[PDB]
Amino acid sequence: VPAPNQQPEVFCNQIFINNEWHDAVSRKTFPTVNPSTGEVICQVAEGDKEDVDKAVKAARAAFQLGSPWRRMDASHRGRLLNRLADLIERDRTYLAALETLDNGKPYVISYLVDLDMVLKCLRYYAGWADKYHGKTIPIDGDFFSYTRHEPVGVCGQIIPWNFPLLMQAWKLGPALATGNVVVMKVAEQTPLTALYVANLIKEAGFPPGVVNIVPGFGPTAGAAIASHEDVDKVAFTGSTEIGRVIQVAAGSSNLKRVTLELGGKSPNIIMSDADMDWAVEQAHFALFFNQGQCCCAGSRTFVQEDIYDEFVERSVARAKSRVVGNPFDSKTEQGPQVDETQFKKILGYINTGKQEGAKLLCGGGIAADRGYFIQPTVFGDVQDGMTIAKEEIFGPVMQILKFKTIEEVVGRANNSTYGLAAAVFTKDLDKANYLSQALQAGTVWVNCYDVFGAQSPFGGYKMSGSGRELGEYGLQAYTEVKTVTVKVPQKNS
Amino acid sequence: VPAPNQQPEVFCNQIFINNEWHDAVSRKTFPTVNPSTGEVICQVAEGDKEDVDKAVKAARAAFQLGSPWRRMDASHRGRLLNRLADLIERDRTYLAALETLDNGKPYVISYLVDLDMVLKCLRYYAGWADKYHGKTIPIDGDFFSYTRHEPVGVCGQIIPWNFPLLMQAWKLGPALATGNVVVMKVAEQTPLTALYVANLIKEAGFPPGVVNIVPGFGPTAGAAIASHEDVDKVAFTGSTEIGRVIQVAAGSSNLKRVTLELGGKSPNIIMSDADMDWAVEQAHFALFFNQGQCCCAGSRTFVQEDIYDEFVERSVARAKSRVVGNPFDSKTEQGPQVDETQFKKILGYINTGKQEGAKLLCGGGIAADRGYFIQPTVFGDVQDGMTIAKEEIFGPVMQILKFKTIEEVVGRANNSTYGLAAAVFTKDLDKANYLSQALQAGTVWVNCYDVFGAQSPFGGYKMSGSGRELGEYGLQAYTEVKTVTVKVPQKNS
Amino acid sequence: QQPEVFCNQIFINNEWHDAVSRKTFPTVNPSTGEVICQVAEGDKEDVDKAVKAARAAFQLGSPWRRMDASHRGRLLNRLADLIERDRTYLAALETLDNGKPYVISYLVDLDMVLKCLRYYAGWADKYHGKTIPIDGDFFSYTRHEPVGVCGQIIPWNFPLLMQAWKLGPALATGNVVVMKVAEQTPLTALYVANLIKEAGFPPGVVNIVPGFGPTAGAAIASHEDVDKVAFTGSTEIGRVIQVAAGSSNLKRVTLELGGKSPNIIMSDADMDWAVEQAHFALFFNQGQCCCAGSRTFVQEDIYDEFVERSVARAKSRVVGNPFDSKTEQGPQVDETQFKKILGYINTGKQEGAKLLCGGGIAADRGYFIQPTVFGDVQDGMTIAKEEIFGPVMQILKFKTIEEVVGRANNSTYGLAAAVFTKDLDKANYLSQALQAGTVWVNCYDVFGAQSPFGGYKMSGSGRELGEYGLQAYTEVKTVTVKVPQKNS
Amino acid sequence: VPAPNQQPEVFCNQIFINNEWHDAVSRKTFPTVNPSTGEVICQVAEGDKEDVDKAVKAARAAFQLGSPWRRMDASHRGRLLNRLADLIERDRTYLAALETLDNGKPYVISYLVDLDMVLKCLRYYAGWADKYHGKTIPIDGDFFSYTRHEPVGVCGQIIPWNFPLLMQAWKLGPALATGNVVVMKVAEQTPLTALYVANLIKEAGFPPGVVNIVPGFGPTAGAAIASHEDVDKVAFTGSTEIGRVIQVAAGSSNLKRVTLELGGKSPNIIMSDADMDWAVEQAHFALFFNQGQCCCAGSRTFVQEDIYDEFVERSVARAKSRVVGNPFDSKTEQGPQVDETQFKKILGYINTGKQEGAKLLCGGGIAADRGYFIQPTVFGDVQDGMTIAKEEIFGPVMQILKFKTIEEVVGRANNSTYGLAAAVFTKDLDKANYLSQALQAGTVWVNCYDVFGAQSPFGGYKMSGSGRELGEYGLQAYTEVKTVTVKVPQKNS
Ligand SMILES: NC(=O)c1ccc[n+]([C@@H]2O[C@H](COP(=O)([O-])OP(=O)(O)OC[C@H]3O[C@@H](n4cnc5c(N)ncnc54)[C@H](O)[C@@H]3O)[C@@H](O)[C@H]2O)c1
Ligand SMILES: [Mg+2]
Ligand SMILES: [Mg+2]
Ligand SMILES: [Mg+2]
Ligand SMILES: [Mg+2]
Ligand code: NA
Ligand code: NA
Ligand code: NA
Ligand code: NA
């Protein structure tokens, strides 16, 4: 890992439309903060309704029939994506540092993980651009029938702050590969890295209007996008609460298509024949990864009674050893939480666990005088009815539960309104096959956790969302299907 | 066509749950009418919220892990669909007669067209039951990744009155093929035929709770389904207006998945090099088919100016000769409209057509002293700004417009919030291709119209809906994708 | 009562013909050695007639070419219904001609035939071509047209089933067929020809020529107007087919040949389950199965235990009259196979393999052979390298997982393999390392109409069953058209 | 287009095994000639049987389970292909010059056409590396069943001289994308450019033994590959005659898998309603492209009788204006034929045509006193029975035939043992659709010719070959299918 610039200069902080930088129409700005210190990094243009309208107009004009973007060879769309990746890899060190500065996550993780996954995602979809075929169809009668897979059109894309650059790539990848145009609303907490990528989108050679980015708040710029009469489709990643607002706004306006990637309360199931060392460490990673700020965090650690006590012991020891501090320090495993609001929600959730009957085993408090650092926390003997067991905490707070049978654990794991992910640790073929089938979750990991691949779809069952990102499946929401049926003189096989 | 019983007995008129017939909890009933005579056929149980709750309860139970329906071989689901089709074919005469009694469409059409399409749809999806594969995926690292295409679960299906049996089949086909369970709410105007099919579903061998049917009204039974906390997915076919309500109810409850098949104002474009005779007869069929009550009716007939006058004259002559009358008469081409409400609505739009300066060329009034018959009506010299050019009439009212260039006609045809279908009539290869590409419609017919194939998807762009039915694409909405990612000792290609 | 034979001639254009030469060959009941009846002996001239009728039926604009794809599917389903109608009869006739136990014919073979035909009935109108976003102002798409006149040559071990595996995909995709059934078991396929006619398939779409290999079979392989050949049988003949294809008109070729499939029992396997499945893996259908687990690799820590149970089970296996419900194992198909198996057993004894049970003739009438088990078999022994195709089990000892992989893969065959273990990692590693077209885990001989089957290496090329089964029966055509202005 | 060095230096002229350069075991070398001057460029190592054995052993070693190439992420195979493309583009000017020196084709063509098509092919298949999924299958019973798409193994690839670089790419692209290893035998007439690419393959980062290249002759090196006991698959492009020898060798040896791309006599059909200017120029291109040395050349130009006389006059005019000379000169449209053998073969067919009674309208003789240049030649009033109408000439020799009806031209066009390609020129939709359906050809062009796309498959019907190259279809022949069926405790949908 290369030595970072621990004070990266910010170059982009305005609204991005038609490959040009603009102030908000209202000329207002908003600050973004370094969560490791609480100090303002810079000001950023605050986009609102009128700024979104301009963006949507630029997108619509870029998507017009006969335009450079509509006529561009599909294979060339692929090259542009590949070019965008090369530019990002060129500025990898800068982008990882800036990612850390604005989000809080350890620089080493931003560099080796986040940036790596951004590149793999973009390079994967570069390859899909000219391979997502429609069909020729042997319909009855003297007819020739076939389908075109056309772009859905103007796509509103609203993303969260936990993985700023990665969330942007999961959005742009499929959308651009299939020839759509984009109006993207980045999180107010973490707008900087995505704005710089906007500049690279320009340098890459994407026609103006194809990607537009409006920094700003949710109920303003986000809402204006979800209710816009000329936005054909919206993709939203964030809280379940706002996911319902997006869905309602879509139906209330123009019936735009919607996919949603929401929260979760994912069960990590450790069977009694599991490799203890592997399972303990992976359970740790499953919860504490990215300051616990991960949609699919293994926040319900079910442990078979035969190994419960030993597992808790080692999980506490590992937790107590987790290094918390400055994200630019190569030794830090956990940076601060994203902002003050998160910081306090988490602390609140810890208090409920204490009063509700959970056994605090370690941590449970503030870890530093400055920034938003929280001590790695582990709760023992958690019950399904407890608050910390049912609600997404989005912090370094671990829930260790206890079970006896496979049939018990399936029922308790599935007794949730969430269904984003699940995992099973066991050496037994039958138990593995049975659990992964029985569990209601979009992703079931076996003997591992948080294994993401650009090739494999990701998304939620139930209230954890609808639709899927990554893989071939991620192309589906960005495709409008047209059937063409033609009368022919004489149909032959 | 075999001689029908013009007074078919009614055997099924209650609520269908767990393969059993029940009265409404409230014991309330509602009348369904013969549109040809305006007389009441029989009373039908009026299902409401509580009856929906029982249906969902039964559907959830049937969908439980380890149930007969979840463990049944995919191939055997196919056989069951095939058995249902065979039973329907056995009772074809009866069902076609009952369809005509309750809906109004010509008995000859019910038999040779509707029933035929019901059989073709069910047999088509019987073949998909064991063929909609998931994927094995070459993900990075030492992992084996694959997807399961599981059923989405409890599916609410809400259908209209214009093709009662066919609409039922378009819904059951893909849903049962992929192992889902159904709570279906049929149109209050035409509940009878679908209820008798429920008897065939039972006779066929489908497990109890797999298909449940609740006859009743929209804002009561329909809204209860759309807002139900334990319904996983809703498929709605009907008006654009109610489509908004469905989408809102989804987001306002449990984020159930939504697909919508709505209305349209489909352009039918006649180029100056078209076969006049063929184009006139097809334009007639495109509008007047099924009493004009077709989502994708060609209700904007664009004709190139060099052939406009001749086209109009011939179109008028054909409309004047269209036989309107008793649906059981083998000579009738057009029965009555479905009910009083639709009847008045069409007459209302004809008034608006006169008031706004559209040239009334034939018909324009009531066509009988009993029932809901309307004279085939043709408006000429129609302009884009007119109401009859913009709104879905859903009656035997034809609009003929004039255009000059290809450029012009593409823009005018696309200048609409609808986009369900469109057609192009020409002998020119390039014109056919440019148009089929330029048109924003889910189906584009060339030198033909209303050609539906079980193999070819159908659905709308824009506010004509979202998602597709028929073909392989019809399976997508009824599938929930699960990624399983397993750690392996050593990954090899 | 034995089933009466109704069909014993050459089937062309939905009509029954004698051979041009008027020659006939007898077919025999292997349980008694007695002649069942005479059968028309097709040769080159009869093949030429069948091919001509096939070509005519495939002509552009013909009823079969113009027929809706969905309707081809209905025809397949109707053919299935008729077979099920006559299920009892076909099962019995299958037993009479082949030798396999009647109960197995009825519950297994006939069941698998119905599932195959009904599965492919559903594919008829679902095998889409593609529309393709090519560079430039062009629109590009592909058609999946039928390959054309398809010669199909099949073996005697599962006569109805092999027929179905061939007809299913060929007919679903609109091809026409000239089929050459095995001389040892021609009867049941000929009765199905009558059903094909009853179901309503147009004349010339399916033609069946009974006869011998070097005559009727070679005439099909070398024919100048046959577009595609599909052969199931011995590796030796598979080579002949291939050469004939190249030497003639370059017709497309797929092959399903023999094997020497390893069945691998790890030390943590379910012992009872493993023993029963290993027994079935080898002895099923008188051992006359291409994918028979004829190399049973057993981990050393459970070797003796496995062997003892395996020998006990083999000694309880009932051999005799296939129409007797007690019978688990009927006779071998004919005298040549009978003698050949006895020969292999002798090499086993001579080469130092340990005869644990059987080894001899099991009846003084018919071609019955005792269930036989060899222990301590070495990789270099004849019975370990060559296909026996009889009720002769080889049990080999191994120690490590890396060892069994190397030894299992050290073969010119690669049709099938199996692994018995409770361990997730061992199962996944082995199923990946093994060079076999089908890898069973904790089961054996599990065939699905939905899942492809075929060999690596010299066990064949191409796959049958599943979607993959349609590939070899499809010819791809690209149509690329200039358009005024390409848009996404 | 950069001015080339007309005398480019040769850096590679040995055998390429395990990323190393080797002299032949025999130390034998063969000279390769500049077809434009008849002069020796340089000597090249002559591979034979023992050199093939070494290459195959190296390929087998590289393909061994657990090797770097087998364990390499599919995504990384994709990255390597892209790197190879970049290096080829980096050295584009040099490769274009060397191609022309060894083959004879115009440098402008080598640069703008061949090199461009190479880059597109490799970059296309780069995207496939991690997207060619196997399936998860809903088999009957309590089982989980799926397929793996594994590589076929050691692939012998034998290529011709007409498109040396392009043919290499069409082979390496799909083979490498799917993780196979290659032993490639390049044409003895044009070994130079493929050997340089080997150097780039090494520079790109492909593991040693993954691609091995053996220059040498057909019946020696080529046959050694076709008959090798340890080669799993062979793909051959060349003459139908040798195609039969390859197929026989496969069956006589180890039953390796075989795909063939052979010659043809493709019909170019000009309807009376075609655009004359466009049809004439495209018909010219279709035949004369690449000195006529193109497998799918339109060497049977059927022209409807009403436009025959005019079409012929303009074709002859265009033929007489075609510039023949030095390939490096920018005005040159036609270079020399590849070698002396092809030179005499073409003079033979020209003489055959004259003695057969075909009307010689222009050319028909030698065009220069040095090199192998042949005058553009046009024969008129060609009949189906003529030899020049049936056999592949592979030279600048055009045949023009007359026809009357569409039904007639179909029969005459299909009456051939070849079926590689065909074209139709017309403005009529119906004629285009009927013909494209009726013609027995692997590729049918409509109002265009020689339009190749990396996305669209190419291959012959009948004796023009078997299997397809390019597109997704090109991956099939390089994939071995494995079904894995696992017993599970309880199967659910
Ligand atoms: N792969 C299998 O499922 C299978 C089936 C039967 C036999 N076998 C093996 O083959 C051995 C002998 O059996 P067999 O002789 O019946 O098999 P075979 O390969 O000789 O016969 C298979 C089919 O091909 C035909 N045939 C034979 N010679 C031919 C030729 N020269 N040209 C064209 N077609 C020809 C036969 O008539 C028969 O219908 C057995 O010991 C067994 O090991 C394998
Ligand atoms: Mg919020
Ligand atoms: Mg209403
Ligand atoms: Mg033989
Ligand atoms: Mg030669
Ligand atoms: Na921030
Ligand atoms: Na009614
Ligand atoms: Na027999
Ligand atoms: Na040369």
SS (H, E, C) D241-285: HHHHHHHHHHHHCCCCEEEEECCCCCEEEECCCCCHHHHHHHHHH
- Residue A142 is classified by DSSP as S
Give break positions in chain D: residue before each, C–N beyond 2.5 Å: none
The pocket around ligand 1, CB under 6 angstroms, is made up of: C 153-157, 180, 182-183, 212-214, 217-218, 221, 232-234, 237, 240, 256-258, 290, 340, 387, 389
Say how far apart CA B293 and CA B281 lie, in whole Å: 18
d(CA D82, CA D70): 19
Alpha-carbon distance D354 to D357, whole Å? Answer: 5
Is C286 found in the same domain as C170? no
| CA D475-D479-D484 angle, 5° bins | 135
- With 0-12 CB in 10 A as exposed, 13-18 as middle and 19+ as buried, what is D89? middle
For residues B73, B77, B79 and B85, what is the CA-based torsion angle, rounded to 10 degrees?
A: 180
With CB atoms and an 8 Å threshold, state whether A482 touches B254: no
- The amino acid that residue D482 corresponds to is K
B493 with D429: Cβ contact below 8 A? no
Residue with tokens 């654009």: B240
A242 labelled ligand-binding:
yes
Q: Which ligand 1 atom is nearest residue C256's CA?
A: 1
Q: Are B374 and B322 in contact (CB under 8 A)?
A: no
Q: Looking at this protein, which amino acid is placed at residue B302?
A: F
Does the CA dihedral B474-B475-B479-B482 come out positive or negative?
Answer: negative
Q: How far away is chain A from the Cα of B144, in angstroms, using its nearest Cα?
A: 10
Elucidation technique: X-ray
User: Residue B257 Cα, ligand 3 centroid: separation in angstroms?
Assistant: 22
* C200 shares its domain with C340: no
Same structural domain, A12 and A137: yes
Name the β-bridge partners of C410: none
Query: Are both D31 and D134 inside the same structural domain?
Result: yes
Residues making up the binding site of C for NAD(+): 233-238
> Is D261 an active-site residue?
yes
Q: Cα-atom radius of gyration of chain B, to the nearest Å?
A: 23
Which residues of chain B are within 8 Å of residue A486 when distances are taken between CB atoms? 432, 445-448
Please name the helix (run of DSSP H) or strand (run of DSSP E) that holds residue B258, with its range, or none.
strand B257-261
Interhelix angle B240-252/A240-252, rounded to 10 degrees, is 170
Catalytic option among B46, B99, B188, B261? B261
Q: Which residue of B has its CA nearest to D491?
A: B71
State both tokens at C239.
Answer: 């080579």
Nearest neighbour of C122 by CB, restricted to B131, B429, B472: B131
User: CATH code at B159?
Assistant: 3.40.605.10
Partners of residue B269 on adjacent β-strands: B302, B424
Query: Token pair of D468, please?
Result: 């397809």
Task: State the pairing for strand pair A397-403/A233-237.
Answer: unpaired
* Distance from the alpha carbon of residue C202 to the mean position of ligand 5, in angstroms: 45
For C155, C166, C206, C477, the CA distances from C175, given in Å and listed in that order, are: 21, 11, 9, 16
Compute how many other C-beta atoms are within 10 angstroms of the C-beta atom of residue C324.
Answer: 12
Mutate to test the interface with D, among B429, B446, B481, B483 (most CBs of D within 10 A): B429
A306 vs A297: CA distance, rounded Å:
24
Min Cα–Cα distance to chain C from A79, Å? 13
Residues D101, D33: Cα–Cα separation, whole Å: 9
CA A146 – CA A136 distance, rounded (Å)? 4
The burial of B85, by beta-carbon neighbours within 10 Å (0-12 exposed, 13-18 middle, 19 or more buried), is given as: buried
Instruction: Compute the distance between CA of residue A215 and CA of residue D82 in angstroms, rounded to an integer.
Output: 35
Is residue D336 within 8 A of residue D36, CB to CB? The reply is yes
Kindly determine whether residue B127 and residue C126, on different chains, have CB atoms separated by under 8 Å: yes
Nearest to C333 by CA among C373, C368, C358, C303: C368
Instruction: Measure the CA angle with vertex A100, ends A94 and A106; round to 5°.
Output: 115
Count of helices and strands (H, E) across chain A: 16, 22
Q: How many CB atoms lie within 10 A of CB C106?
A: 17
* Neighbour-count burial for D342-367, b at 16+ CB within 10 Å, e otherwise: bbebbbebbeebeebebeebbbbeeb
Q: Are residues C251 and C265 in the same domain?
A: no
> With b meaning 16 or more CB within 10 Å and e meaning fewer, what string describes B282-295?
bbbebbbbbbbbbb
Q: How far is the centre of ligand 5, averaged over its atoms, from the C-alpha of D261 (Å)?
A: 15
Of all helices (H) and strands (E), which one includes residue A97?
Answer: helix A92-103
**Mapping DSSP to helix (H, G, I), strand (E, B) and coil, where does residue B436 land?**
helix
For chain C, how many structural domains are there in total? 2
CA-based Rg of chain A, rounded to a whole angstrom?
Answer: 24
C475 CB-near residues (< 8 Å, 6+ apart): C144, C145, C146, C147, C148, D461
Pocket test for ligand 1, best of C152, C157, C234 (most atoms within 8 A of CB): C234
DSSP secondary structure code for residue B81 in this structure: H
**What CA–CA distance (Å, rounded) separates D355 from D349?**
10
How wide is the angle at C-alpha D317 spanned by C-alphas D316 and D322, nearest 5°? 95
Task: Give the Å distance between the CA of B158 and the centre of ligand 3.
Answer: 12
**HEC states along D22-86?**
ECCCCCCEEEEEECCCCEEEEEEECECHHHHHHHHHHHHHHCCCCCHHHHCCHHHHHHHHHHHHH
Interface list for B 387-446 with A (CB within 8 A): 410, 417, 432, 436-438, 441-446
Cβ atoms of residues D69 and D62 within 8 Å? yes
Active-site position among A121, A155, A294, A295: A295
Can you tell me the distance from the alpha carbon of B296 to that of B441, in angstroms, rounded to the nearest whole number? 10
Residue burial B437-468, b: 16+ Cβ < 10 Å; e: rest: bbbbbbbbbbbbbbbbbbbbbbbbbbbbbbbb
Positive or negative: CA dihedral B442, B448, B452, B457: negative
SS3 D399: strand
CA distance D105 to D112: 12
- Expressed in percent and rounded to 5, the helix, strand and coil fractions of chain A are 40, 20, 40
E-state strands within B255-331 = 257-261, 267-270, 300-304
Alpha-carbon dihedral sign for residues C150, C154, C159, C161: negative
- The structure tokens listed for A454 are 């650009």
CATH number of the CATH domain containing A382? 3.40.309.10
Q: Which ligand sits nearest to residue A37's alpha carbon?
A: 6
| Integer angstrom CA distances of residue B63 from A434, B53, B207 | 17, 15, 10
Tokens of C362: 């099991």
Residue B339 corresponds to which amino acid? D
Residue D257, beta-bridge partner list: D233
Tallying the residues shown for chain C, one arrives at 488
The catalytic position among D261, D294, D392, D469 is D261
Query: Which is it for the CA torsion B416, B419, B421, B427, positive or negative?
Result: positive
The rounded Cα B388 to chain-centroid distance in angstroms is: 22
Beta-carbon neighbour count of residue D192 at 10 Å? 25
Cβ contact, residue pair B65, D492, below 8 Å: yes
Full residue range of the structural domain in which residue C138 is found: 1-258+449-488
Residues 313-332 of A with CB under 8 A from B: none
Nearest partner of D202 among D72, D60, D357, D83, judged by Cα: D83
The whole-angstrom separation of Cα D426 and Cα D270 is: 7
Same-domain pairing of B340 and B400: yes
Which residue reads 């066990």 in tokens?
Answer: C459
Which atom of ligand 1 lies nearest, measured to the CA of C162? 3
A391 marked among binding-site residues: no
Tokens found for residue A215: 């920094």
Determine how β-strand C474-482 pairs with β-strand D443-446: parallel
B217 and B356 housed in the same domain: no
Residue nearest to atom 5 of ligand 1 (CA): C233
CA atoms within 13 A on the CB side of B359: 11
Question: How many alpha carbons fall within 13 Å on the CB side of residue B92?
Answer: 19
CA distance C485 to C139: 10
C73 reaches A (C-beta below 8 A)? no
Q: State the burial class of residue C35 (Cβ atoms within 10 Å of its Cβ: 0-12, 13-18, 19+).
A: exposed
Indicate whether A270 and A284 sit together in one domain. Answer: yes
Residues B297 and B175 in one domain: no
Segment 81-120 of chain D within 8 Å of chain A by CB: 82, 120
Phi, psi of C316 (to 5 degrees): -95, -5
Q: Are residues D324 and D371 located together in one domain of the fold?
A: yes
Instruction: Answer whether D137 touches B (CB < 8 Å).
Output: yes
Residue with tokens 């009509």: C15
Do both A246 and A321 map to the same domain? no
Q: How far apart are CA C120 and CA C163, in angstroms?
A: 13
Chain B residue with Cα closest to A146: B456
Checking DSSP bridges between strand D143-151 and strand D134-137, what pairing results, if any?
A: antiparallel
Q: State whether B259 and B302 are in the same domain.
A: no
SS3 A196: helix
Interchain CB distance below 8 Å, D437 and A75: no
Burial of C26 (0-12, 13-18, 19+ CB in 10 A): exposed
CA distance C159 to A122: 53
Question: Could C122 and B133 be called an inter-chain contact, meaning their C-beta atoms sit closer than 8 Å?
Answer: no
**What's the CA-to-centroid distance between B44 and ligand 7, angstroms?**
11
Whole-angstrom Cα distance, residue C70 to residue B476? 21
Q: Do C70 and B433 touch (CB under 8 A)?
A: no
Which tokens in the block code for residue A162? 């936990």
- In the reported structure, the alpha carbon of residue D413 is separated from the centroid of ligand 1 by a whole-number distance in angstroms of 40
Element housing B27 (H / E)? none
Using DSSP's 3-state secondary structure scheme, residue B155 falls into strand
Buried b (16+ CB within 10 A) or exposed e, D386-397: bebbeebbbbbb
